[PDB]
Amino acid sequence: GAMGSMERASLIQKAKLAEQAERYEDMAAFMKGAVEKGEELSCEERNLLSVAYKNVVGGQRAAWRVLSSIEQKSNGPEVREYREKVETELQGVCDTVLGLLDSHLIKEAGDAESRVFYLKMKGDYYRYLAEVATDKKRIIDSARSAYQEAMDISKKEMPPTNPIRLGLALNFSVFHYEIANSPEEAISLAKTTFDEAMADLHTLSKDSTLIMQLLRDNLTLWT
Amino acid sequence: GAMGSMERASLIQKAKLAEQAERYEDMAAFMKGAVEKGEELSCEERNLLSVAYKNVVGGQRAAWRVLSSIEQKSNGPEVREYREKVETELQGVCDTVLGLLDSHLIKEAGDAESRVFYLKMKGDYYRYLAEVATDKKRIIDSARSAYQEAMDISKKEMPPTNPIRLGLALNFSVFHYEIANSPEEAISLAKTTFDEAMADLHTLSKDSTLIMQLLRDNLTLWT
Numbered sequence: 001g002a003m004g005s006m007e008r009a010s011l012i013q014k015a016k017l018a019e020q021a022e023r024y025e026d027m028a029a030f031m032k033g034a035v036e037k038g039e040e041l042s043c044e045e046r047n048l049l050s051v052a053y054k055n056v057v058g059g060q061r062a063a064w065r066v067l068s069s070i071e072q073k074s075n076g077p078e079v080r081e082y083r084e085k086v087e088t089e090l091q092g093v094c095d096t097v098l099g100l101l102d103s104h105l106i107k108e109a110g111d112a113e114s115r116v117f118y119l120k121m122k123g124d125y126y127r128y129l130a131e132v133a134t135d136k137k138r139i140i141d142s143a144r145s146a147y148q149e150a151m152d153i154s155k156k157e158m159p160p161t162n163p164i165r166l167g168l169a170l171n172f173s174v175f176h177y178e179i180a181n182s183p184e185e186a187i188s189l190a191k192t193t194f195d196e197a198m199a200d201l202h203t204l205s206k207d208s209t210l211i212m213q214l215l216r217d218n219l220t221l222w223t
Numbered sequence: 224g225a226m227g228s229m230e231r232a233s234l235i236q237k238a239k240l241a242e243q244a245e246r247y248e249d250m251a252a253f254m255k256g257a258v259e260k261g262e263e264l265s266c267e268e269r270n271l272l273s274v275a276y277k278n279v280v281g282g283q284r285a286a287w288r289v290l291s292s293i294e295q296k297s298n299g300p301e302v303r304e305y306r307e308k309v310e311t312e313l314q315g316v317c318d319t320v321l322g323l324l325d326s327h328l329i330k331e332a333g334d335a336e337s338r339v340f341y342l343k344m345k346g347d348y349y350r351y352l353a354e355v356a357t358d359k360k361r362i363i364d365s366a367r368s369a370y371q372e373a374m375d376i377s378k379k380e381m382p383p384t385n386p387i388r389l390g391l392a393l394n395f396s397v398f399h400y401e402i403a404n405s406p407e408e409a410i411s412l413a414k415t416t417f418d419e420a421m422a423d424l425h426t427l428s429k430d431s432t433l434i435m436q437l438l439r440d441n442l443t444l445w446t
């Protein structure tokens with residue numbers, strides 16, 4: 001791999017530089033290189049991995065949605081071709097992330113924080129695949145199964161206010177609403193999650209109110 | 224070239240789609256392909272070419288400035304290496320643009336609008352090269368010579384309110400201030416340009432007040 005000759009610590013350092021420079025493709029490539037060193041990731045390093053790929057795929061998703069909307073309105077080959085080009089690139093990034101998860105990260109992750117984090121990522125990237133799929137049913141099932149395993153662990157091992165637990169619940173509720181055609185399940189999940197977190201605030205000394213607000217924002221739109 | 228098999232009209236269409244999707248690297252590659260068909264560009268097509276590359280290089284410039292600022296504050300090899308990586312990529316894009324200008328576009332451009340447009344672009348991309356150069360003097364001279372030839376044509380052939388003329392003057396004034404160490408020349412140019420445009424408004428039936436405002440913004444900062 002192109003990063004094989006660079007020290008792990010140097011890859012991490014350069015990922016952090018790339019983050020400051022808003023060079024997310026570079027950031028992702030540095031973090032992929034780091035993963036491929038074969039050592040587990042720390043909490044901070046997992047965050048760098050996630051943010052990098054979330055920004056790469058986010059730009060591809062936004063572009064895909066622009067092109068798909070133009071395509072749907074049109075209904076020559078150019079709009080479909082270019083939509084397909086963006087779609088293939090998006091799929092490739094999702095496949096790269098899922099490959100890192102499968103080959104390197106999920107099987108070695110024993111602590112609840114890391115395991116839930118990676119299983120959430122797996123659900124997220126299957127979700128992104130599902131947004132463009134038409135096939136679709138198997139991808140949807142793969143996202144659901146990853147999210148559900150993460151949920152089971154998070155409920156057993158993490159407090160209701162843990163930010164990973166909260167972000168997982170937020171994303172799984174969006175999966176229910178937008179992907180799985182299950183708005184009632186989405187609403188139930190978001191509401192139970194929010195209420196249980198409210199009741200656990202008392203034990204605490206920013207990430208989690210942020211996410212709680214996002215749950216409330218979705219609930220406001222959905223109800 | 225990778226676009227050699229695609230119709231010219233399809234490349235133009237896909238550049239416009241890429242613009243809507245904020246996919247500027249794709250937009251640039253489509254417009255490079257179009258240029259390499261060997262036909263002159265229309266006014267609209269020149270704008271697509273410019274916007275595409277301006278956005279690509281703009282992201283590289285912003286990242287370079289972040290990394291250079293970190294490097295300067297530091298004064299291991301990682302910050303310099305990664306700054307150099309971004310710098311080389313930026314230089315490559317500038318070289319690509321300058322190559323299109325030289326090989327295809329400037330020699331065939333006979334009308335004042337197209338000639339000034341392309342010579343302005345040439346000055347711009349030498350300017351971007353000059354921002355990272357340390358060498359530097361020859362690049363600065365190449366930018367100056369391109370801008371000056373464009374200026375001579377624009378003053379002879381275009382009215383003072385023409386947006387290309389205005390944008391050229393704006394950029395050449397920034398070259399004087401930021402690159403060439405000539406703030407008095409920058410101020411003189413911006414002020415003469417603004418005043419002469421004010422006096423020609425009367426002949427007119429958005430692009431040019433925008434640029435006039437940018438001239439005034441710079442003058443406010445400089446004086």
Ligand SMILES: C=CC(C)(C)OC[C@H]1O[C@H](O[C@@H]2C3=C([C@H](C)COC(C)=O)C[C@H](O)[C@]3(C)/C=C3/[C@@H](COC)CC[C@H]3[C@@H](C)[C@H]2O)[C@H](O)[C@@H](OC(C)=O)[C@@H]1O
Nearest residue numbers: 047048050051117118120121163164167168206207210211
């Ligand atoms: C190194 C800096 C970067 C990568 C920008 O850090 C991103 C952020 O990284 C941490 O925050 C995580 C985190 C985010 C927070 C919700 C951001 O919070 C604020 C207040 O900005 C959003 C990010 O995408 C990130 C890394 C991702 C997840 C998500 C990962 O799923 C696989 C699950 C929820 C959330 C968790 C892991 C957050 O803890 C930190 O706790 C945040 O800082 C604090 C304490 O507020 C920091 O902004």
Ligand SMILES: C=CC(C)(C)OC[C@H]1O[C@H](O[C@@H]2C3=C([C@H](C)COC(C)=O)C[C@H](O)[C@]3(C)/C=C3/[C@@H](COC)CC[C@H]3[C@@H](C)[C@H]2O)[C@H](O)[C@@H](OC(C)=O)[C@@H]1O
Nearest residue numbers: 270271273274340341343344386387390391429430433434
């Ligand atoms: C196809 C749409 C895109 C590519 C977004 O169009 C970009 C823009 O293209 C035209 O505007 C040009 C133009 C710009 C205008 C100043 C933008 O005006 C407004 C009101 O947004 C900025 C662009 O970068 C562009 C193409 C570039 C130049 C610059 C090129 O140097 C080599 C010299 C000055 C300026 C000229 C060419 C402008 O005429 C149009 O006249 C603008 O629309 C009008 C009439 O207001 C449109 O937003």
Ligand SMILES: [Cl-]
Nearest residue numbers: 081082085237
């Ligand atoms: Cl295409």
Ligand SMILES: [Cl-]
Nearest residue numbers: 014304305308
């Ligand atoms: Cl590097």
Ligand SMILES: [Mg+2]
Nearest residue numbers: 112157158159
């Ligand atoms: Mg625990």
Ligand SMILES: [Mg+2]
Nearest residue numbers: 335380381382
């Ligand atoms: Mg004329």
